[PDB]
Amino acid sequence: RVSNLEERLRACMQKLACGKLTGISDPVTVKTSGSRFGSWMTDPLAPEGDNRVWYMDGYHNNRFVREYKSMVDFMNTDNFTSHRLPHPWSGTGQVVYNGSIYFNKFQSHIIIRFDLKTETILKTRSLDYSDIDLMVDENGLWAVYATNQNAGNIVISKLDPVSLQILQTWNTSYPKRSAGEAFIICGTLYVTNGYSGGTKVHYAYQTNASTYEYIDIPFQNKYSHISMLDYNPKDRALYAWNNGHQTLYNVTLFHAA
Amino acid sequence: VSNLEERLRACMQKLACGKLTGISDPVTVKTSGSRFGSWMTDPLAPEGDNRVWYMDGYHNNRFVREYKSMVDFMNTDNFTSHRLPHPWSGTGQVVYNGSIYFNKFQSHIIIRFDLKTETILKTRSLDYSDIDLMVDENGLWAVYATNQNAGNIVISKLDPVSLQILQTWNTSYPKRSAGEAFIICGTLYVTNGYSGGTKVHYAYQTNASTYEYIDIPFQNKYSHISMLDYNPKDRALYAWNNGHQTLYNVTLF
Ligand SMILES: *[C@@H]1O[C@H](CO)[C@@H](O[C@@H]2O[C@H](CO)[C@@H](O)[C@H](O)[C@H]2NC(C)=O)[C@H](O)[C@H]1NC(C)=O
Ligand SMILES: *[C@@H]1O[C@H](CO)[C@@H](O[C@@H]2O[C@H](CO)[C@@H](O)[C@H](O)[C@H]2NC(C)=O)[C@H](O)[C@H]1NC(C)=O
Ligand SMILES: *[C@@H]1O[C@H](CO)[C@@H](O[C@@H]2O[C@H](CO)[C@@H](O)[C@H](O)[C@H]2NC(C)=O)[C@H](O)[C@H]1NC(C)=O
Ligand SMILES: *[C@@H]1O[C@H](CO)[C@@H](O[C@@H]2O[C@H](CO)[C@@H](O)[C@H](O)[C@H]2NC(C)=O)[C@H](O)[C@H]1NC(C)=O
Ligand SMILES: *[C@@H]1O[C@H](CO)[C@@H](O)[C@H](O)[C@H]1NC(C)=O
Ligand SMILES: *[C@@H]1O[C@H](CO)[C@@H](O)[C@H](O)[C@H]1NC(C)=O
Ligand SMILES: [Cl-]
């Protein structure tokens, strides 16, 4: 199938162009709307003709997902379609991946896969261990959280996007309490210092080698508070919810291994 | 489809790249030919095309043996011979994308010869086995020594169609002292000699334009090696070992 090879080729090229984070560009304010907390994103596996933006206000008591037709439509207008999820989410760490929205069920360790076209829950899984951050990079679906197994320290888990089974789990040394926002680029989890004030990326955990090291990659916090910061492997950019603002960070990568 | 299948393979191979860390014990594929020669398979060949190309001698020969597959090559002496328009020199030939790239007899002339049409597609002279052509995950290469470089090995990235020199690197390694050499993921590995206890002890990364001396031993099973080339498709070192056809498995990192 031609459509299949084009998917495998695109995925391969993204992995081939993988690097380690060295620089974060200046943010471009996409839109100014919503409350203090929230999330906005696009589907990294969406077809070329699919540039839809998915938008979710708040980190609690909300079932409604906004669907904008395009990126330009999301900037200049407010014409969107409201989707009512069967369950409200918790936190701002959900992702739209391959036509489905993956989110954390309100006040629970339960991860839900919800098909946005069929309007149907496809899978439901509890970790039994924004408390849970779901994210996607060049390698697939991820889950970032914390356990009492660790000393409250951040935990990474690779998830099968269909069965939602944990494929592999990593222990980190970074305590979630002192953790700002986080994002995974090319299998390596980057952790920021805080949510408010001046923000920098000062922690990096490579999952391929199970090693961590302390870095220092500054990026201006254009506004007071950052409630979401997620990486999109297709755009090679950082999606951010910045205190009622939707901002985009360009990203540069340098590496060979 | 067929184009995407090849673009996917080219991408997957590049993704699995890494610097050489090990060379396994060789496997004797066949015992034939004179003391010098070269044998290979087209890295950009379809899955149904497992043909083995065979070139006996290093001086004034113009006949290439074509075996239908690895099986027919290993277990049979049934082959069809191709007559090249010009004799080659040395054992630094490569069969790339249906064409044989060889150095014209006693010259700096590289000839691209399509084996199906039996025609010469391109002919180019360089500035200067004197010229060794090889293929890795990145395409076609030319390795030799120049006059500007103090007899040191010189790498040139070639355009497989126009035989144009895209980029040139000058190593710090004298070709006279050099044994056989091969390119893996844009890095020239140079052996210590053709005979005795052989080992890879020089690696030049063309990407960073840097070099480092190493120590990667491998079994020179039949004492003398006149050909040693890397094939990015099956990730193995092809070798003409003193009238013997051998294969080395390679581990990267
Ligand atoms: C994303 O989801 C699509 C389906 O929406 C997957 O497409 C399937 O691809 C396989 C072969 O790769 C086919 O056998 C299936 O029939 C396809 N599904 C459908 C419904 O046609 C695609 O593989 C998914 N991609 C990832 C990375 O999970
Ligand atoms: C993450 O860390 C916890 C604790 O640091 C690990 O749990 C330990 O597991 C070992 C055997 O694997 C036991 O001997 C210890 O008694 C456990 N300690 C605790 C406090 O539970 C856990 O296995 C680690 N997981 C991963 C994936 O690294
Ligand atoms: C190997 O040879 C084939 C055949 O000539 C090349 O295929 C050509 O690909 C280009 C674009 O990639 C097309 O425009 C041509 O029509 C193709 N040729 C034919 C005959 O269909 C292929 O590109 C070559 N590969 C390399 C690496 O040189
Ligand atoms: C290089 O390694 C490959 C894989 O280990 C070898 O291919 C295997 O050959 C054995 C026979 O001893 C088979 O049982 C395996 O099934 C083969 N593997 C595959 C993936 O088909 C290959 O023979 C080795 N070649 C050399 C020259 O060492
Ligand atoms: C990122 O850089 C690209 C290339 O110049 C540009 O097209 C794009 O608008 C930039 N995006 C941001 C958010 O700066
Ligand atoms: C070595 O290569 C560099 C890079 O192109 C070039 O400037 C220099 O002249 C070369 N030296 C010799 C001796 O070839
Ligand atoms: Cl990767």
Numbering used by the authors:
A (entry chain B): 210 to 338, 353 to 480
B (entry chain A): 211 to 338, 353 to 477
Question: Which sentences from the paper describe this structure?
Answer:
It binds a number of secreted proteins and cell surface-bound receptors to induce cell signaling processes.
This yielded diffraction quality crystals and a data set to 2.4-Å resolution. Cys221 in this coiled-coil segment forms an interprotein disulfide, covalently linking the two β-propellers. Hence, the two β-propellers in the covalent dimer have a 60° angle between each other, resulting in an exposed outward orientation of the β-propeller top faces. Remarkably, all glycosylation sites are located at either the side or the bottom of the β-propellers, whereas the top faces are free from glycans and completely exposed.
